[PDB]
Structures are given as structure tokens and as C-alpha cells.
């Protein structure tokens with residue numbers, strides 16, 4: 001996890017080869033590509049409660065809000081298993097209104 | 110690690126709080142105090158210099 005100790009990018013793995021009086025390291029790394037821009041927010045307010053992502057960021061495609069993982073764009077809908085709650089929505093700078101979906105009660109019809 | 114991708118600075122500070130074991134609500138609920146403390150700490154360096 002040391003930055004730039006095993007090449008440029010996120011180190012995946014490395015292979016050694018012998019040279020005359022030396023060694024050659026072939027570093028395999030992961031390099032992110034083809035980014036898009038989005039709107040973002042730190043928390044989400046629902047029922048007077050602030051919701052934070054468990055892992056990921058809240059992003060908006062223009063009209064809807066999703067959670068994604070931070071390094072590869074893979075959007076999902078914001079549920080109570082995606083997030084955790086802390087406090088009320090009066091203290092966070094930049095909080096946004098949206099609905100956080102519960103699975104249990106629409107299972108219970 | 111590649112191309113520069115923008116992110117707002119308080120959200121970068123929250124990632125970094127996660128990286129030491131503190132949840133990020135602790136940053137967002139203290140943002141103003143944390144920024145005051147950083148500013149006083151930076152203002153103390155030029156005084157010693």
C-alpha cells in the first residue's frame with residue numbers, strides 16, 4: 001500500500017526476473033480510466049435524520065441519488081443497509097433531501 | 110495514481126478520517142472546529158519561523 005514503491009497506480013502484483021548482476025521487477029498495477037463528473041453530497045436527510053454512506057459516496061446523475069463505491073462507478077439505490085444514521089439534519093454543511101428505502105416494511109405489505 | 114479527479118475538500122478530509130479509524134460523521138459534525146484548529150496550527154508555524 002506504499003505509494004509508488006511498486007510502480008505507478010494501485011499495486012496488484014509483481015514478478016521478478018534475473019539480469020546480469022541485477023534484478024528486474026515487472027510491476028502489475030491498476031490504473032483508473034474514463035471518468036465522469038457527478039453532483040455529490042456528504043449526507044442525506046430523511047425523517048429528520050442524517051444518513052451517511054457505509055462505504056461509497058452519494059452521487060447524483062442529474063435527478064436521482066445513488067451510492068457508489070469510490071473507485072469504480074457502480075450505482076445502487078440508497079437503503080438502510082447502504083447507510084448508517086447519526087444525529088439530525090441541522091449540523092452538516094451541504095446536506096440534501098432524499099428518501100432512504102427500507103426493505104422490511106415493503107416486504108410486510 | 111492516474112488522472113486528477115476532483116472531490117470537495119471536506120469530503121476528502123472525511124475519507125482521511127476514515128483512513129485512521131474514525132467515522133466520518135465525526136468530521137462532518139465538527140467541521141468548523143477542525144478547520145479553526147488547522148488554521149491556528151498553520152498560523153503558529155510562521156510565527157516560529
Ligand SMILES: *[C@@H]1O[C@H](CO)[C@@H](O[C@@H]2O[C@H](CO)[C@@H](O)[C@H](O)[C@H]2NC(C)=O)[C@H](O)[C@H]1NC(C)=O
Nearest residue numbers: 038059060061062063064065066075076077078
Ligand atoms: C438517472 O438515472 C435514472 C435511473 O434510475 C433515470 O430515471 C428513470 O427511472 C425510472 C424509474 O426509476 C426507470 O424506469 C427508467 O428506466 C430510468 N431512465 C429513463 C430514461 O427513464 C434517469 O433518466 C437518469 N437521469 C439522467 C439525467 O440521466
Ligand SMILES: *[C@@H]1O[C@H](CO)[C@@H](O[C@@H]2O[C@H](CO)[C@@H](O)[C@H](O)[C@H]2NC(C)=O)[C@H](O)[C@H]1NC(C)=O
Nearest residue numbers: 040041042043092093094095096117118119120
Ligand atoms: C458552494 O458555493 C456556492 C457559491 O458559489 C454556494 O451557493 C450559495 O449559497 C448561498 C446559501 O448559503 C446563497 O445565498 C448564494 O446565493 C449561493 N451562491 C451561488 C453563486 O449560488 C453553495 O451553498 C456552496 N455549497 C455548500 C455545500 O456550502
Ligand SMILES: *[C@@H]1O[C@H](CO)[C@@H](O[C@@H]2O[C@H](CO)[C@@H](O)[C@H](O)[C@H]2NC(C)=O)[C@H](O)[C@H]1NC(C)=O
Nearest residue numbers: 044045046047048049089090094095096097098
Ligand atoms: C429538506 O426537507 C426539510 C424537511 O421539510 C426542509 O425543512 C423545511 O425547511 C423550510 C425552509 O427552510 C421550513 O420552512 C420548514 O419549516 C422545514 N420543515 C421542517 C419539518 O423542519 C428543508 O428546507 C429541505 N431542504 C431544502 C433544500 O429544500
Ligand SMILES: *[C@@H]1O[C@H](CO)[C@@H](O[C@@H]2O[C@H](CO)[C@@H](O)[C@H](O)[C@H]2NC(C)=O)[C@H](O)[C@H]1NC(C)=O
Nearest residue numbers: 138139140141142143144145146147148149150
Ligand atoms: C474539544 O476541545 C476544543 C479545544 O480545541 C474545545 O473547543 C474550545 O472550547 C473552549 C471552551 O473552554 C472555547 O473557549 C474555545 O473557543 C474552543 N475552541 C474552538 C476552536 O472552538 C471543545 O469545546 C472541546 N469539546 C468537548 C466536547 O470538550
Ligand SMILES: *[C@@H]1O[C@H](CO)[C@@H](O)[C@H](O)[C@H]1NC(C)=O
Nearest residue numbers: 033034035036037038114115
Ligand atoms: C467535468 O466538468 C468540468 C467542467 O465543470 C470539465 O472541465 C471536465 O472536463 C469534465 N470532466 C468529465 C469527465 O466530464
